[PDB]
Amino acid sequence: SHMVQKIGILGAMREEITPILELFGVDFEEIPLGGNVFHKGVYHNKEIIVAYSKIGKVHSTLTTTSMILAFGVQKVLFSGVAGSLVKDLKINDLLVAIQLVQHDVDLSAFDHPLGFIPESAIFIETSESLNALAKEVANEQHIVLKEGVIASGDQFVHSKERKEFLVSEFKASAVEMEGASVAFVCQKFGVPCCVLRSISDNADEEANMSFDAFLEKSAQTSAKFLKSMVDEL
Amino acid sequence: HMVQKIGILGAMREEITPILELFGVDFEEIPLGGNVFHKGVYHNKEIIVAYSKIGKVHSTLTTTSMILAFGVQKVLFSGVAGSLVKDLKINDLLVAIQLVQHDVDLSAFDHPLGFIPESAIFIETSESLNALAKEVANEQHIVLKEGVIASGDQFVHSKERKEFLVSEFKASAVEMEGASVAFVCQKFGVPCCVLRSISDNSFDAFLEKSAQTSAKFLKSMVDEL
Numbered sequence: 001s002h003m004v005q006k007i008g009i010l011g012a013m014r015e016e017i018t019p020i021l022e023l024f025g026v027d028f029e030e031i032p033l034g035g036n037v038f039h040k041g042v043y044h045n046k047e048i049i050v051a052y053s054k055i056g057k058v059h060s061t062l063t064t065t066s067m068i069l070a071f072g073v074q075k076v077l078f079s080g081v082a083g084s085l086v087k088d089l090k091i092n093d094l095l096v097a098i099q100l101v102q103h104d105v106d107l108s109a110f111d112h113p114l115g116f117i118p119e120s121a122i123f124i125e126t127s128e129s130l131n132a133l134a135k136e137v138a139n140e141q142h143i144v145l146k147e148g149v150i151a152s153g154d155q156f157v158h159s160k161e162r163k164e165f166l167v168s169e170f171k172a173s174a175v176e177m178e179g180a181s182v183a184f185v186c187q188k189f190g191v192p193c194c195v196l197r198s199i200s201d202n203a204d205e206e207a208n209m210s211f212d213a214f215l216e217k218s219a220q221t222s223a224k225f226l227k228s229m230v231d232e233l
Numbered sequence: 234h235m236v237q238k239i240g241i242l243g244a245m246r247e248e249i250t251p252i253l254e255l256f257g258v259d260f261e262e263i264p265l266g267g268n269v270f271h272k273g274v275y276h277n278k279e280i281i282v283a284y285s286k287i288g289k290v291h292s293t294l295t296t297t298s299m300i301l302a303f304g305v306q307k308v309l310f311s312g313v314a315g316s317l318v319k320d321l322k323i324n325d326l327l328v329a330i331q332l333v334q335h336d337v338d339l340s341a342f343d344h345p346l347g348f349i350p351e352s353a354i355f356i357e358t359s360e361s362l363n364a365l366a367k368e369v370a371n372e373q374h375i376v377l378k379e380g381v382i383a384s385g386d387q388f389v390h391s392k393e394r395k396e397f398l399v400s401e402f403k404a405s406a407v408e409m410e411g412a413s414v415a416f417v418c419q420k421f422g423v424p425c426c427v428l429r430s431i432s433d434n435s436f437d438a439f440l441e442k443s444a445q446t447s448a449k450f451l452k453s454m455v456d457e458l
């Protein structure tokens with residue numbers, strides 16, 4: 001029914017949604033579609049649709065589209081982990097993405113700026129309203145929540161040279177592989193989106209080792225915070 | 234019972250009018266997710282035609298929308314691609330037997346390039362549509378070339394990057410949207426056929442010519458479906 005509010009909650013990997021399903025604690029019906037498993041439950045009278053997309057831009061575009069078109073979700077909250085590009089963002093710290101960019105798009109051979117695609121824009125915006133809510137919830141929990149630009153692309157970044165490019169070209173604070181495609185799809189449909197990330201690594205030569213040591217704790221941190229936001233919705 | 238619903242995607246806007254005009258039936262414009270879908274009925278099949286837009290996110294969105302919102306059961310995707318190999322020339326028509334996202338890189342974890350966990354490097358296409366393409370080609374006096382198409386969100390033109398696509402994936406041609414549309418179709422169980430006219434071994438003139446011959450090719454595949 002259109003009288004039932006529907007909220008999509010997305011992560012990229014199983015580990016990013018496991019804690020979400022546990023924290024919400026209601027029974028979820030499993031519904032397979034398009035290679036994804038959607039978990040549908042009712043929490044405080046809201047239908048919550050939870051899924052992990054699998055990694056990267058094509059997987060996350062597909063899953064966000066299914067949530068909106070097939071499940072009729074009217075907000076998307078994305079939760080997961082990211083690599084830090086700035087010294088003040090340390091392991092486990094939370095960032096909300098005020099703008100996102102696809103950092104790997106390169107049509108500069110035809111004089112477009114890096115990150116730009118025709119009919120689109122370098123920077124994609126998220127919901128003022130939901131980010132304002134994230135800030136209120138962080139303040140009300142005594143959690144430090146940074147706001148910044150997140151760069152997304154289909155490579156796991158693990159080099160000083162790529163980090164330096166991300167900071168100089170886009171002034172990005174963190175890097176990951178899905179945010180910009182989820183925020184893009186939500187913008188095309190006019191659906192409010194929030195992208196929350198907790199830092200798992202520093203996107204440098206050691207990033208794989210950090211990512212594996214910290215993924216689960218960082219995914220839990222983001223997942224708890226997302227649950228705090230749904231509790232105020 | 235249910236009508237057959239066929240989706241036709243063009244990778245360039247210039248390809249779209251030639252398609253609608255050749256089908257010769259009335260098309261209704263339906264906007265959705267910033268895309269425009271043209272819906273008509275040709276020989277009692279529903280035909281939904283759209284430009285994919287540029288880059289993998291745009292084309293994943295267009296394809297997922299066509300499947301979920303219009304119920305397309307098979308997808309034909311036409312466009313242009315640059316050659317990576319010695320035996321292709323301008324205006325050759327190539328059917329993609331497999332595709333790859335050539336820019337995917339999780340090598341920090343010792344995964345091979347192009348690979349994502351819970352996925353695979355190569356994306357397959359429809360044996361029965363690719364066979365139909367070969368039949369149509371016969372009838373239209375076209376030699377259909379077969380190969381691997383590599384797709385990524387960068388324009389590929391350097392010697393080093395072209396030789397990488399050949400050595401890493403044995404790709405025959407390169408473009409930006411094919412892999413993502415074939416991948417979405419695979420996820421949903423939708424037969425897909427990806428056809429590309431080879432652009433380089435005057436662009437606007439090549440584009441205008443290839444759009445007409447591809448329109449003609451697509452319509453005669455539909456005639457056999």
Ligand SMILES: Nc1ncnc2[nH]cnc12
Nearest residue numbers: 082083156157176177203
């Ligand atoms: N360094 C990194 N690069 C891309 N995506 C990530 N997610 C977490 N860390 C990342």
